[PDB]
């Protein structure tokens, strides 16, 4: 499906996980920020490409990036 | 206008210019520029079998290194100059400045 | 210490930042070994998302 | 009067006043100096 | 404190008052930027000098002509007159000579104390203490300036004030000769004869 | 200094070079090798103008016409160029120009092929048959050379601009006209008519 | 004559247009009583047209084929009043406006809440800024020469390359 990437600029605010409508992102332990956590995308095959996770990231430029592509059945959001 | 005399004089003059006064300058410039290079290396070094310099045709015994290709080039320039001269003399156009 | 002093005026060298070649005020610097972007910078003007603060490493901030 | 003066100093009210004054000035100038294509000097 | 152009007003910070002719008049802040005031002082000095010369050459000759002695053509019609030389050639010689003079003045302004010596004859030294007043045998033969007393002021104030008056007078002559098409002295006598029907209103609108 | 008293000199123009008066308002000589090339070109241009001025004044003074009309024979078909009145039998259009091209190409090529910049400007040797380099007055002689050279350069530019200004007239005739009416016939006739 | 244009004083098309407009106005006038207000308005129209055409003729305007004044904007001394003189007046006014606006922005960047000063204009500050536009070209040249007019490229936000 689409490709979702997380960068070291993340601050572990979890706001991208809460905005995801298909449960693609999750928070994992990390040691590069004060929050001691970082976002991750273990199940991007369920990603639809809404980039709501991108709109919720507060860093200057996005620590979470969605690149789109493939456009499989789950990606197109088809119920038929 | 004498065609033979004009052509011969122009060709000889430009061959002399290319052989004596301009040969070192042309040699220096071809040495500085060198063979055209494709990307870092020459076209032949990149795998172009048809871009190899023709050494057999470029062999010469003239002590100054004057090659038959140089002869052709300077002779073509001389013939062009001679025919320009002949056409302008046998023109009939007088601007009368 | 890690980076600039608190309250100092720093200029951003991050090319991808909305505030490249812009001046901000340092709010806090974290001394925890392992933090990659510890310097907190406040800016007078917001970015497109509406955020006026960010985190930078000391190597991409210069003193005025 | 502080609040009234602040409101009158807002962008739209001041724009209305300034542009109305400019329009009146131009209209009166055209009343007394109409239909001129060349600046006479 | 010295009198100001507007009573009750505060003089600009960059008009310290020690400068001759100072009255606090800078409402448009044309000399606020440091280092720009000296250039303006030089410009005003030269404008004053040229305007005083112009007024003495416009009013005195026409006044004498009106009296009767030393009859000369009007100043605005003086250009279209026959001379021993062509007007254009005279203009070019004028431009070249003034180019020399004003280039020396420019070199003095850009760096004080550099062009006070004669080029051809090194012995001569036309030395002046302050920029704008080139003391020496030329421009000051009587010795009435050149630091006779510390803090000259008063005489410098006299010259700046008379020059300001001369500038306004010359501009007035220009404008009211463009309007009335009449000599300044004749305009003065017309005003002195019928002051209430020959004025600015009755020349542009009547 | 020099060209403008009191003016700070540019760093690249210290003043040791002949004619170095520090005149460079546009900063063309900032690059050192470009400055050396400019020195060489200035010297060549100045020498050509020096040699050109007598070839413009003498023929007009002797009654053989001005320099602008010196090529006027070539414009007409069958010009039959002349020298001191005597016609030149080999002065047809398609031989003198070729001779010029070949000979000047030879001299230009020999000059171009010398490495040392000092000898590129002042070769000497076979070019000094009368010495004038054994004495200690060599540097001031270079200064005199560049001074007469710039003077002649401006003189030839005046020749050209006056040729455009008054076509069909020679510089010496222009001098006569100035001597006739110095206060009516000047540059003002061209720039402000 | 400056592109084969005759002066409008001796332009036959210009006079023809004069006559046609006056005739049309008089035809519109014939259907009203002389003392009526519409008649006065139409007569004022006729006087306005007459003075307009006389003014156009008196300034040496160039009429082409038929009667239509054409403007020369090449810098000719005989036509400076068409583009160069009003052009300079425009440049003075436009530069006034821009310069005073820039001055106001400068003077409100040092305030504690500049945005409130932009949406709510400080009328006294704005007016004493506007008063400074009389000599705007001198201030512009001074700032340009001093270096306070143009910001250095090192302090301006740019996008990645
Ligand atoms: C950019 C395009 C453009 C241009 C160049 C013009 C230009 C002109 N139009 Mg046109 N017009 C336009 C667009 C344009 N218009 C549009 C879009 C419309 C549709 C709304 C019209 C509708 C229209 C009509 C209906 C009329 C014009 C008229 C005019 C003329 C004079 C208007 C006027 O007020 O002058 C009068 C002069 C002034 C107001 C002078 C400016 C005064 C200020 C305050 C400066 C004060 C002096 C200053 C401080 C000192 C300067 C130095 C000093 C020495 C002078 C002028 C030729 C009128 C005209 O006469 O036609 C020929 C006319 O009747 N236009
Ligand atoms: C050259 C610049 C300049 C300018 C623009 C002004 C302008 C003004 N002055 Mg100032 N003034 C100046 C120079 C200047 N003065 C100088 C050099 C002096 C001598 C120190 C004064 C001394 C002076 C006094 C003492 C007063 C003014 C006053 C005034 C105002 C009323 C005059 C009026 O409207 O005309 C009317 C003209 C006539 C009646 C003639 C006016 C705003 C008066 C004012 O309004 O005070 C606020 C006032 O009381 N001025
Ligand atoms: C072009 C001539 C000129 C120049 C360069 C100066 C320059 C200066 N004057 Mg002087 N001044 C002049 C003319 C001039 N003045 C005239 C004619 C008057 C009589 C009204 C005065 C009266 C005066 C006083 C009373 C004082 C000064 C002061 C100053 C200094 C303040 C900085 C400043 O704003 O000046 C810069 C000025 C300019 C660059 C000229 C701007 C010209 C504008 C753009 C147009 C002029 C307006 C209009 C078109 C013409 C007048 C219209 C008429 C109806 C009056 C500076 C050294 C003050 C100072 O420090 O004392 C030494 C001071 O107290 N001046
Ligand atoms: C800015 C300064 C200035 C300028 C540009 C002029 C310009 C002029 N003046 Mg001068 N004049 C000035 C100041 C100035 N005046 C002053 C301050 C006075 C003293 C009151 C005079 C007294 C004066 C007299 C008495 C006469 C002129 C005349 C003239 C005009 C003829 C050409 C000329 O200069 O005479 C030619 C050059 C000289 C007289 C210089 C001396 C050289 C001779 C050979 C000795 C000319 C327009 C003459 C005129 O009006 O005729 C049209 C004339 O008769 N002027
Ligand atoms: C030294 C300064 C000075 C003096 C003494 C005079 C004196 C005179 N002027 Mg001149 N004038 C001056 C400066 C001066 N003016 C300036 C700076 C201008 C340019 C705006 C003019 C423009 C001018 C015109 C266009 C006319 C006069 C006229 C007059 C006369 C009648 C007064 C008048 O119309 O109101 C003076 C009007 C002014 C606009 C000047 C105001 C400024 C001064 C300093 C006060 C009188 C002889 C009239 C005339 O010749 O009638 C016989 C006339 O038609 N003046
Ligand atoms: C830059 C160097 C230069 C150049 C290009 C010319 C070019 C020319 N000169 Mg000039 N001349 C020069 C230097 C130069 N001269 C100098 C230094 C002197 C002084 C000795 C003269 C003295 C001179 C005279 C007196 C005459 C010329 C003439 C001529 C023309 C005829 C060709 C010729 O000389 O036949 C020479 C041919 C051979 C040597 C073979 C030609 C346009 C003649 C002319 O104007 O006729 C149109 C003429 O009468 N020249
Ligand atoms: C007056 C101008 C002038 C001056 C001062 C110099 C000075 C110098 N030159 Mg330069 N030169 C000039 C003009 C000048 N030259 C011109 C016009 C040419 C082109 C032909 C050259 C070409 C040239 C070369 C190629 C070389 C020099 C060299 C030298 C140096 C040694 C020779 C010497 O002392 O000259 C003394 C000069 C004079 C005493 C001038 C006398 C004038 C004579 C008599 C001719 C005038 C006759 C007539 C009026 C014009 C007709 C032209 C004629 C040839 C037909 C010295 C720095 C050499 C150098 O620096 O190497 C170390 C060198 O290699 N010069
Ligand atoms: C040192 C070199 C030199 C010399 C001695 C002359 C001398 C002369 N020139 Mg020439 N001139 C020169 C350089 C020179 N000019 C240059 C470099 C240019 C190009 C800007 C001109 C462009 C030029 C023109 C366009 C005219 C003259 C004219 C004149 C004559 C009268 C005007 C005058 O006094 O000169 C003024 C010289 C300069 C301002 C320079 C005079 C014989 C005039 C002439 O011949 O009329 C009879 C003429 O119409 N000159
Ligand atoms: C008036 C004048 C300038 C006035 C400027 C003013 C008021 C500026 C005011 C301000 O900037 C300040 C001060 C402070 C700012 O915060 C506010 C303002 C208000 C903006 C200059 C005159 C300047 C006057 C000059 C230069 C006069 C020159 C005269 C000449 C050249 C005469 C030539 C004639 O020669 C005669 C003599 C002989 C004849 O026969 C022939 C000819 C040729 C016609
Ligand atoms: C042996 C020898 C010798 C000699 C030799 C010779 C002399 C050679 C020559 C050679 C030559 C001599 C060559 C030539 C060549 C040429 C060419 C190669 C040409 C070309 C041309 C062209 C191509 C042209 C064209 C044209 C024209 C121009 C006209 C018509 C049209 C046309 C366009 C077609 C000697 C004795 C010294 C000794 C040593 C060795
Ligand atoms: S694009 Fe949408 S679905 Fe995919 S990770 Fe971002 S928020 Fe979740
Ligand atoms: S990617 Fe952005 S929104 Fe998601 S946890 Fe990291 S900083 Fe927060």
Coordinates of C-alpha atoms in Angstrom, one line a residue, chain F:
Chain F
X1 CA 46.4 59.7 -5.2
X2 CA 47.7 60.9 -8.6
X3 CA 44.6 60.7 -10.9
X4 CA 42.6 62.0 -8.0
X5 CA 44.5 63.6 -5.1
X6 CA 43.6 62.1 -1.7
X7 CA 41.7 59.2 -3.2
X8 CA 42.5 55.8 -1.6
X9 CA 44.3 53.5 -4.1
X10 CA 42.9 50.0 -4.9
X11 CA 44.9 47.3 -3.3
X12 CA 45.9 45.7 -6.6
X13 CA 47.4 48.9 -7.9
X14 CA 50.2 49.7 -5.5
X15 CA 51.9 52.3 -7.8
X16 CA 55.1 50.6 -8.8
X17 CA 54.0 49.8 -12.3
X18 CA 54.7 52.4 -15.0
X19 CA 51.8 54.8 -15.4
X20 CA 50.1 53.3 -12.3
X21 CA 48.0 56.3 -11.1
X22 CA 45.5 54.1 -9.3
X23 CA 42.7 54.9 -11.8
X24 CA 40.2 52.0 -11.7
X25 CA 36.7 53.2 -10.8
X26 CA 35.0 50.1 -12.2
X27 CA 37.4 47.6 -10.6
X28 CA 38.3 45.9 -13.9
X29 CA 41.8 44.9 -12.6
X30 CA 40.7 43.1 -9.5
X31 CA 41.8 39.7 -10.9
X32 CA 45.6 39.7 -11.1
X33 CA 46.1 37.8 -14.4
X34 CA 43.3 39.9 -16.0
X35 CA 45.3 42.9 -14.8
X36 CA 48.4 41.6 -16.5
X37 CA 46.5 41.0 -19.7
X38 CA 45.1 44.5 -19.5
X39 CA 48.6 45.9 -19.1
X40 CA 49.7 44.0 -22.2
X41 CA 46.6 45.1 -24.2
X42 CA 47.0 48.7 -23.0
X43 CA 50.6 48.7 -24.3
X44 CA 49.7 47.2 -27.6
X45 CA 46.8 49.6 -28.1
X46 CA 48.9 52.6 -27.1
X47 CA 51.7 51.7 -29.5
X48 CA 49.3 51.2 -32.4
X49 CA 47.7 54.6 -31.7
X50 CA 51.2 56.2 -31.4
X51 CA 52.2 54.8 -34.7
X52 CA 48.7 55.8 -36.2
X53 CA 48.7 59.5 -35.3
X54 CA 51.5 60.5 -37.6
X55 CA 50.0 58.4 -40.3
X56 CA 46.9 60.5 -39.9
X57 CA 48.4 64.0 -39.5
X58 CA 51.4 63.9 -42.0
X59 CA 49.4 62.8 -45.1
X60 CA 46.8 65.5 -44.5
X61 CA 49.5 68.2 -43.8
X62 CA 51.2 67.3 -47.1
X63 CA 48.0 67.6 -49.1
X64 CA 47.3 63.9 -49.7
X65 CA 43.9 64.0 -47.9
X66 CA 42.6 63.1 -44.5
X67 CA 42.6 59.6 -42.9
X68 CA 38.8 59.1 -43.3
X69 CA 39.1 59.5 -47.0
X70 CA 42.3 57.4 -47.1
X71 CA 40.3 54.3 -47.7
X72 CA 38.0 56.2 -50.1
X73 CA 39.9 54.7 -53.1
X74 CA 39.0 51.2 -52.0
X75 CA 35.3 52.1 -51.9
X76 CA 35.3 53.0 -55.5
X77 CA 35.8 50.2 -58.1
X78 CA 39.3 50.4 -59.4
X79 CA 40.6 52.8 -56.7
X80 CA 44.3 52.7 -57.8
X81 CA 45.7 53.5 -54.4
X82 CA 48.5 56.1 -54.2
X83 CA 51.5 56.9 -52.1
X84 CA 52.9 60.4 -51.9
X85 CA 51.0 61.0 -55.2
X86 CA 52.7 58.2 -57.0
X87 CA 50.2 55.4 -57.7
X88 CA 50.8 51.9 -56.3
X89 CA 50.9 49.3 -59.1
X90 CA 50.0 46.5 -56.6
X91 CA 47.3 48.4 -54.8
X92 CA 44.2 46.5 -56.1
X93 CA 41.7 45.4 -53.4
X94 CA 42.5 41.5 -53.5
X95 CA 46.3 41.5 -52.8
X96 CA 47.2 44.2 -50.3
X97 CA 44.6 42.9 -47.8
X98 CA 45.9 39.3 -48.2
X99 CA 49.4 40.5 -47.7
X100 CA 48.3 42.4 -44.6
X101 CA 46.5 39.3 -43.2
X102 CA 49.5 37.0 -43.7
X103 CA 52.2 39.4 -42.4
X104 CA 50.3 40.6 -39.4
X105 CA 49.3 37.1 -38.6
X106 CA 52.9 36.2 -38.6
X107 CA 53.9 39.0 -36.3
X108 CA 50.9 38.4 -34.0
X109 CA 51.7 34.7 -33.8
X110 CA 55.3 35.3 -32.9
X111 CA 54.2 37.7 -30.2
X112 CA 51.6 35.4 -28.8
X113 CA 54.1 32.6 -28.3
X114 CA 56.3 34.0 -25.5
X115 CA 55.7 32.9 -21.9
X116 CA 57.3 35.7 -19.8
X117 CA 54.8 38.6 -19.2
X118 CA 57.7 41.1 -18.8
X119 CA 58.9 40.1 -22.3
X120 CA 55.3 40.1 -23.5
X121 CA 55.2 43.8 -22.6
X122 CA 58.9 44.8 -23.2
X123 CA 60.6 42.2 -25.3
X124 CA 63.8 44.1 -26.1
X125 CA 66.7 42.3 -27.7
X126 CA 66.3 42.6 -31.5
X127 CA 63.7 45.4 -30.9
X128 CA 66.4 47.7 -29.3
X129 CA 69.0 48.2 -32.0
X130 CA 69.9 51.6 -30.5
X131 CA 70.4 50.3 -26.9
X132 CA 68.3 52.4 -24.6
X133 CA 68.3 49.7 -22.0
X134 CA 71.8 49.7 -20.7
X135 CA 71.2 53.0 -18.9
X136 CA 69.4 53.5 -15.6
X137 CA 66.7 55.7 -17.2
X138 CA 64.7 52.7 -18.4
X139 CA 61.8 52.8 -15.9
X140 CA 61.1 56.5 -16.5
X141 CA 61.3 55.8 -20.2
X142 CA 58.6 53.2 -19.7
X143 CA 56.6 55.9 -17.9
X144 CA 57.1 58.3 -20.8
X145 CA 56.0 55.6 -23.2
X146 CA 52.8 54.9 -21.4
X147 CA 52.1 58.7 -21.0
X148 CA 52.5 59.5 -24.7
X149 CA 50.6 56.3 -25.3
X150 CA 47.5 57.1 -23.4
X151 CA 47.7 60.6 -24.8
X152 CA 47.7 59.3 -28.3
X153 CA 44.9 56.8 -27.5
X154 CA 42.7 59.7 -26.5
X155 CA 43.8 61.6 -29.5
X156 CA 42.7 58.8 -31.9
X157 CA 39.4 58.5 -30.1
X158 CA 39.0 62.2 -30.8
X159 CA 39.9 61.6 -34.4
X160 CA 37.1 59.0 -34.7
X161 CA 34.4 60.9 -32.8
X162 CA 35.2 64.0 -34.9
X163 CA 35.0 61.9 -38.0
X164 CA 31.4 61.0 -37.1
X165 CA 30.7 64.6 -36.0
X166 CA 32.0 66.3 -39.2
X167 CA 32.0 63.7 -42.1
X168 CA 34.3 64.6 -44.9
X169 CA 36.6 66.7 -42.7
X170 CA 40.1 65.9 -41.3
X171 CA 41.3 66.4 -37.8
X172 CA 43.8 69.1 -38.9
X173 CA 41.0 70.9 -40.7
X174 CA 39.0 70.8 -37.5
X175 CA 42.0 72.4 -35.8
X176 CA 42.0 75.1 -38.4
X177 CA 38.2 75.6 -37.8
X178 CA 38.8 75.9 -34.1
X179 CA 41.5 78.5 -34.7
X180 CA 39.2 80.4 -37.0
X181 CA 36.2 80.7 -34.6
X182 CA 37.2 79.2 -31.3
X183 CA 34.0 80.5 -29.6
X184 CA 31.4 79.3 -32.1
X185 CA 32.8 76.0 -33.4
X186 CA 33.3 73.6 -30.5
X187 CA 32.0 70.3 -29.3
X188 CA 28.8 72.1 -28.2
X189 CA 27.8 72.1 -31.9
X190 CA 27.3 68.3 -31.6
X191 CA 26.0 67.6 -28.1
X192 CA 23.8 70.7 -27.8
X193 CA 22.6 71.9 -31.2

